């Protein structure tokens, strides 16, 4: 699916 | 105890900007991507895009790029989503919602704010007229007459109706307002009573309107023909 | 944009009845499908995420199926707080998008209207405008045709209609056609009637006035 990038 | 808090309603004209704010309570706030979704009034839902409030990544929906920005304060945990070069088209109700973002990609919108609401539009503030919706003889149905009131010509929303400083409720019906080719709002309240006791009760719709800061009570009663 | 095509747009149904929601998706999108609950005033509420997995709150009779494109949600044994709106929504690629919703609304006995016509009061006449109001209240179903005859002339585009939402006592609707003219037209006709046709109505009921009397 679509992703935005890490968070930690 | 997750909770997205927004800011309050907003009302605007066309080519300005507005600037919403939705701040997150109870779960760590750069843990999750954060979308924002609109309503228009009995619409649909539409996506307008999601932030990483972690990094600042965003990505934003095609038809809204170079017009509605992103951004984070992560110092109180606020997002922030500003819509600019505004047109009447842009009036809904605009949410913020945080996404489960298991594996650090969309599943599924499980905490969402309450809601900001934007209006835009050319017209100015302006108090309604309210007129009454006077009970005849003639519309008698059964024992019931109907009567009400007409509110009329006010912008923005909302207004609030009430019957005989609240003390009346049963039988009431206060219909959703209509936005008028004129772009000024006009709703009715009505209300079904003993056709029996018209000669003798009293019927006062008080209406408020904050925006304008007017406040009307408007006596209904029966048309009497000489 | 991948097109989320719900089916049906609108249903009926009794506490107890099992519901079945399509959603059919213009590409394929793996079980990156989710599924919401709205109600009137307040964001949605996801139900169902991954297409079929349960999200923790919500109650067992909630259940979904579909991998690709062809996705469905049922509702096992309806519950009087299920009566709402249901949308599907994909994440498999960008713009996010959203079904165009399956309203849920409960169904009861046929109830006909009462009418009511309430011409423009002299207050509102002497500001250069006329509405006339007619109010349908208290009944089921939904559909209602409401038609503005002035001099048994049919009006077309000079009214706005407003409709509450089911009640949550009775199960019924009311409504409320308002036809606006300027003064110049309203005074140009004497004879004002609303026509109001419905399930419950043998044949249309008329309700009129004179202007001026």
Same mark, same amino acid.
């Given at each position: 699916?679509?992703?935005?990038?890490?968070?930690? | 105890?997750?909770?997205?808090?927004?800011?309050?309603?907003?009302?605007?004209?066309?080519?300005?900007?507005?600037?919403?704010?939705?701040?997150? %309570?109870?779960?760590?706030?750069?843990?999750?991507?954060?979308? !924002?979704?609109?309503?228009?009034?009995?619409?649909?839902?539409? !996506?307008? @895009? !999601?932030?990483?409030?972690? =990094?600042?990544?965003? %990505?934003?929906?095609?038809?809204?790029?170079?017009?509605?920005?992103?951004?984070? *304060?992560?110092?109180?945990?606020?997002? %922030?989503?500003?819509?600019?070069?505004?047109?009447? #088209? *842009?009036?809904?109700?605009?949410?913020?919602?945080? #996404?489960?973002?298991?594996?650090?990609?969309?599943?599924?919108? *499980?905490?969402?704010?309450?809601?900001?609401?934007?209006?835009?539009?050319?017209?100015?503030?302006?108090?309604?007229?309210?007129?009454?919706?006077?009970?005849? =003889?003639?519309?008698? $149905?059964?024992?019931?007459?109907?009567? @009400?009131?007409?509110?009329? *010509?006010? %912008?923005?929303?909302?207004?609030?109706?009430?019957?005989? =400083?609240?003390?009346?409720?049963?039988?009431?019906?206060?219909?959703?307002?209509?936005?008028?080719?004129?772009?000024?709002? =006009?709703?009715? $309240?009505?209300?079904?009573?003993?056709?029996?006791?018209?000669?003798?009760?009293?019927?006062?719709?008080?209406?408020?309107?904050?925006?304008?800061?007017?406040?009307? #009570?408007? +006596?209904?009663?029966? +048309?009497?023909? #000489? | 944009?991948?097109?989320? &095509?719900?089916?049906?747009?609108?249903?009926?149904?009794?506490?107890?009845?099992?519901?079945?929601?399509?959603?059919?998706?213009?590409?394929?999108?793996?079980?990156?499908?989710?599924?919401?609950?709205?109600?009137?005033?307040?964001?949605?509420?996801?139900?169902?995420?991954?297409?079929?997995?349960?999200?923790?709150?919500?109650?067992?009779?909630?259940?979904?199926?579909?991998?690709?494109?062809?996705?469905?949600?049922?509702?096992?044994?309806?519950?009087?707080?299920?009566?709402?709106?249901?949308?599907?929504?994909?994440?498999?690629?960008?713009?996010?998008?959203?079904?165009?919703?399956?309203?849920?609304?409960?169904?009861?006995?046929?109830?006909?209207?009462?009418?009511?016509?309430?011409?423009?009061?002299?207050?509102?006449?002497?500001?250069?405008?006329?509405?006339?109001?007619?109010?349908?209240?208290?009944?089921?179903?939904?559909?209602?045709?409401?038609?503005?005859?002035?001099?048994?002339?049919?009006?077309?585009?000079?009214?706005?209609?407003?409709?509450?939402?089911? /009640?949550?006592? /009775?199960?019924?609707?009311?409504?409320?056609? &308002?036809?606006?003219?300027?003064?110049?037209?309203?005074?140009?006709?004497?004879?004002?009637?609303?026509?109001?046709?419905?399930?419950?109505?043998?044949?249309?009921?008329?309700?009129?006035?004179?202007?001026?009397?």
């Amino acid at each position: 699916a679509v992703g935005i990038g890490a968070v930690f | 105890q997750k909770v997205l808090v927004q800011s309050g309603a907003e009302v605007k004209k066309p080519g300005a900007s507005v600037k919403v704010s939705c701040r997150a %309570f109870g779960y760590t706030f750069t843990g999750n991507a954060l979308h !924002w979704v609109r309503q228009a009034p009995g619409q649909g839902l539409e !996506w307008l @895009g !999601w932030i990483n409030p972690h =990094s600042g990544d965003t %990505f934003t929906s095609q038809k809204f790029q170079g017009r509605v920005y992103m951004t984070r *304060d992560k110092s109180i945990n606020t997002a %922030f989503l500003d819509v600019t070069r505004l047109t009447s #088209d *842009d009036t809904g109700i605009y949410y913020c919602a945080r #996404d489960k973002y298991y594996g650090n990609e969309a599943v599924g919108m *499980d905490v969402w704010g309450q809601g900001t609401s934007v209006t835009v539009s050319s017209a100015s503030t302006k108090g309604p007229s309210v007129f009454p919706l006077a009970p005849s =003889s003639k519309s008698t $149905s059964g024992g019931t007459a109907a009567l @009400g009131c007409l509110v009329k *010509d006010y %912008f923005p929303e909302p207004v609030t109706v009430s019957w005989n =400083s609240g003390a009346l409720t049963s039988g009431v019906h206060t219909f959703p307002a209509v936005l008028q080719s004129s772009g000024l709002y =006009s709703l009715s $309240s009505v209300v079904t009573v003993p056709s029996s006791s018209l000669g003798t009760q009293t019927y006062i719709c008080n209406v408020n309107h904050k925006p304008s800061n007017t406040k009307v #009570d408007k +006596k209904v009663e029966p +048309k009497s023909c #000489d | 944009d991948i097109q989320l &095509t719900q089916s049906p747009s609108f249903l009926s149904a009794s506490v107890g009845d099992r519901v079945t929601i399509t959603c059919r998706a213009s590409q394929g999108v793996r079980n990156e499908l989710a599924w919401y609950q709205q109600k009137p005033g307040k964001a949605p509420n996801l139900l169902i995420y991954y297409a079929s997995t349960l999200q923790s709150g919500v109650p067992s009779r909630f259940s979904a199926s579909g991998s690709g494109t062809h996705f469905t949600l049922t509702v096992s044994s309806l519950q009087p707080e299920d009566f709402a709106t249901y949308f599907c929504q994909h994440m498999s690629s960008y713009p996010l998008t959203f079904g165009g919703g399956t309203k849920v609304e409960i169904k009861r006995t046929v109830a006909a209207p009462s009418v009511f016509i309430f011409p423009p009061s002299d207050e509102q006449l002497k500001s250069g405008t006329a509405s006339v109001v007619c109010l349908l209240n208290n009944f089921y179903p939904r559909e209602a045709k409401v038609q503005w005859k002035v001099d048994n002339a049919l009006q077309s585009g000079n009214s706005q209609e407003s409709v509450t939402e089911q /009640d949550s006592k /009775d199960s019924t609707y009311s409504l409320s056609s &308002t036809l606006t003219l300027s003064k110049a037209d309203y005074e140009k006709h004497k004879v004002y009637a609303c026509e109001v046709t419905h399930q419950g109505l043998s044949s249309p009921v008329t309700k009129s006035f004179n202007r001026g009397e």
